[PDB]
Design brief:
The complex is a heterotetramer, with two copies of chain A (98 residues) and two copies of chain B. With 98 residues, chain A is mainly beta. Chain A has helices at residues 4-13, 24-27, and strands at residues 16-23, 34-37, 40-47, 55-73, 81-97. Chain A is elongated. Chain B is an all-beta fold and 194 residues long. Chain B is built from no helices and 17 strands. Chain B folds into two domains: 1-93, Immunoglobulin-like, CATH 2.60.40.10; 94-194, Immunoglobulin-like, CATH 2.60.40.10. Chain B is rod-shaped. In chain B, strands 1, 3, 4, 7, 8 and 9 form a six-stranded mixed β-sheet that branches. Classes of the chains: A mainly beta (98), B mainly beta (194). Chains in contact: A-B, A-C, A-D, B-C, C-D. Chain C binds chain D through residues 26-27, 31-36, 38-39, 71, 73-77, 80-81, and chain D through 1-2, 4, 63, 75, 77, 115-118, 130-132, 141-143, 163-166. The structure holds a molecule of 3 linked components (NAG-NAG-BMA) (5 copies), a molecule of 2 linked components (NAG-NAG) (2 copies), 2-acetamido-2-deoxy-beta-D-glucopyranose (NAG) (2 copies) and cesium ion. A molecule of 2 linked components (NAG-NAG) binds next to β11 of chain D. Chain B: It comes from Homo sapiens. Chain B: It is found in: Cell junction; Endoplasmic reticulum; Cell membrane.
Chain lengths: 98, 194, 98, 179
């Protein structure tokens, strides 16, 4: 009981793939006079806490997802055009050193 | 009931109204406006929020400026119908200042390296186009500068570089910054001698 | 259509809302330089996602607080890990605010 | 219980799962992720008198471990101890008028997995405030001594010591006060 919850805290916080909202513009170093709609995409990324320091939760295998969204480029030259972009979707993670 | 997808440009001005052009065939049609995400529904209150059928749905831009997309929706006898999705786009345009560094007294010997920074400070949701003027035939490098937080500005940099100047490079150097609806510029005289 | 379907799905999944994250206890302020936490992290919900304007940030509008119990290792190893009770913020509603 | 892992990661570590029946088939579970380690007769064993013996590098990832045939959970703890330097800022020439505010920073730089205890010495209204500094295989610790309005008696040697558990480095500086 006293130890039931603690084990639950570990389990829930372990290194593993997690749904995050990735900012498209930043992920590809896109000039910010160029707007993405939506600005973000949902993908899974490795996250959580390792039990030593200098051990970081990293991806050991990655799938890639084609996603389509719209791109505005300001100062308004045109309306929004559809662009297809591939984002990393981590499928497995491990606490590794660096 | 409504005449692939559209676009709504919002001023972000917290009191100017915006019109979604959900045109109507039946001027006596009960139209609501859905926005997402999160999901909201706006009914005409007879005052600020209305639907003219000839114009479309009229609503204060601040009520839907959070949203990714909006659309008109009407019910007729237990069945509801939607217009085309409209993409919401909060653009800004306000340029505070455009400033050259160095700003004055620039003096080079022939063969020395000229470096001119042009910094533009703007409100949010602004994109900047830089345009230079200089004496006749220079590398340009534009980029974004980090700024905030809570500071309500964006900061843009354009850097002019001449690798080893010549007597012909003496003259007026002008940097202009354009947001789409507004342009501010600055300048400085560069002197060169042997 | 088919393109519109997914785009709407990207927005929905990336909207400002409470999300499960792993919070590093020590870094959440006021921790004695001689303490390690075990586990280092706790699972709580925090406001996250993407707003559609800039300068607007996903923030919490109401917060519950969770008592959680974990262990604290001190230095030197004079004693063993001792149980500590700590309260962490658990965001329960969020809004894109300036 | 607690299991301390050291820098020598090939060096073996012993989880003290004591046995009543010296002929007991014991496995070692670690989490998370979940792993189970069986004695291979070589590196990995269980002596009943000692407990379960395993190369520390096999379980250094884990939050906790336990013997199973289950014993009590053991908390896993990777610990460093190496302190690089301890440095005072300002470091010297400190000179105050009576009533002037003294602020002394003590910064300790250490290897990873280190915890620091600070201890000061000073002449006989001194406030201490310890905290962690962000960072590069290092950790950075700060301890700030503050005297809100000094007096003649505060003139003397100020010593900051940093302890990791197995190692202590210190630094000092003379503070002069005049009137
Ligand atoms: C784990 O996931 C990461 C992505 O989060 C993977 O790293 C990425 O790998 C791709 C291709 O290996 C890199 O694409 C490259 O982009 C650079 C320009 O940024 C370009 O120089 C290359 O030609 C290529 O187009 C991408 O940069 C990289 N992301 C980084 C560096 O953060 C990685 O492959 C995954 N690892 C495993 C083992 O699953
Ligand atoms: C990007 O990565 C995520 C996370 O790795 C992927 O989500 C994963 O989808 C697979 C395939 O459906 C799921 O596997 C399933 O596991 C359950 C047990 O819970 C099993 O009963 C099913 O038969 C199936 O094998 C998996 O749950 C899920 N992973 C996680 C951690 O949520 C996904 O493939 C990728 N995202 C997209 C949109 O492609
Ligand atoms: C949104 O959630 C944040 C936390 O994620 C809330 O901020 C917190 O507000 C409380 C006051 O209700 C602060 O309490 C603090 O108490 C400590 C002593 O225990 C004291 O040192 C602080 O001066 C303060 O009084 C707490 O610091 C603060 N959390 C942090 C670290 O920012 C906030 O209330 C939530 N906002 C809404 C509208 O729900
Ligand atoms: C920590 O934050 C999370 C996320 O904000 C909170 O989760 C929410 O917990 C409440 C229960 O107090 C759930 O309300 C329930 O909603 C369901 C339908 O969604 C309904 O059937 C129930 O009658 C009730 O209204 C809510 O769903 C849930 N949201 C989730 C899953 O994220 C949680 O309350 C916070 N922790 C504490 C102790 O307050
Ligand atoms: C307090 O004690 C520490 C050690 O715990 C003193 O260490 C200082 O370390 C620095 C960096 O290594 C030394 O700097 C030196 O720079 C020159 C470059 O040619 C050269 O002498 C060495 O290669 C070294 O890098 C520094 O000399 C050394 N101590 C002194 C006396 O300056 C720290 O300085 C002490 N703080 C005090 C008492 O102010
Ligand atoms: C060009 O640059 C100069 C600064 O180098 C700007 O000059 C400022 O102008 C305002 C009034 O317009 C004054 O209140 C400031 O004191 C001026 N600063 C200096 C140092 O003189 C000028 O604003 C810039 N031009 C534009 C269009 O931004
Ligand atoms: C001791 O360390 C603290 C934290 O780094 C220093 O506090 C900063 O002081 C500088 C200069 O006065 C300020 O610009 C910062 O805003 C301060 N930061 C904080 C968090 O207070 C302090 O200066 C250091 N003391 C000395 C003498 O080195
Ligand atoms: C905003 O402008 C309207 C006119 O369109 C005005 O009637 C109203 O008072 C203003 N909003 C506020 C702050 O009440
Ligand atoms: C140009 O701008 C950058 C970024 O602000 C700065 O580092 C550099 O010093 C600037 N050059 C001049 C001449 O001001
Ligand atoms: Cs942008």
């Amino acid at each position: 009981e006293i130890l039931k919850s603690i084990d639950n805290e570990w389990r829930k916080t372990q290194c593993m793939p997690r749904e995050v909202a990735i900012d498209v513009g930043k992920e590809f170093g896109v000039a910010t006079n160029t707007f993405f709609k939506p600005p973000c995409v949902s993908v899974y990324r490795c996250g959580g806490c390792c039990n030593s320091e200098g051990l970081q939760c990293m991806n050991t295998s990655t799938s890639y997802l084609s996603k389509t969204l719209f791109e505005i480029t300001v100062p308004l030259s045109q309306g929004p055009k559809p662009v297809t972009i591939s984002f990393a979707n981590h499928t497995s993670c491990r606490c590794m050193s660096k | 009931p409504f005449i692939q997808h559209g676009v709504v440009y919002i001023t972000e001005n917290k009191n100017k109204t915006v019109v979604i052009p959900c045109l109507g065939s039946i001027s006596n049609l009960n139209v609501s406006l859905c926005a997402r995400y999160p999901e909201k529904r706006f009914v005409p209150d007879g005052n600020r929020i209305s639907w003219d059928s000839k114009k479309g749905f009229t609503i204060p831009s601040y009520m839907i400026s959070y949203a990714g997309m909006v659309f008109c929706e009407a019910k007729i006898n237990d069945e509801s119908y939607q217009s085309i999705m409209y993409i919401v786009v909060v653009v800004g345009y306000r340029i505070y200042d455009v400033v050259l560094s160095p700003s004055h007294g620039i003096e080079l010997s022939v063969g020395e390296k000229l470096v001119l920074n042009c910094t533009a400070r703007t409100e949010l949701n602004v994109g900047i186009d830089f345009n230079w003027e200089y004496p006749s035939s220079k590398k340009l490098v534009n980029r974004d500068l980090k700024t905030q937080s809570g500071s309500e500005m964006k900061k843009f940099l354009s850097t002019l570089t001449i690798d080893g100047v010549t007597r012909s490079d003496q003259g007026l150097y002008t940097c202009a910054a354009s947001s789409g609806l507004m342009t501010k510029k600055n300048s400085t005289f560069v002197r060169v001698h042997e």
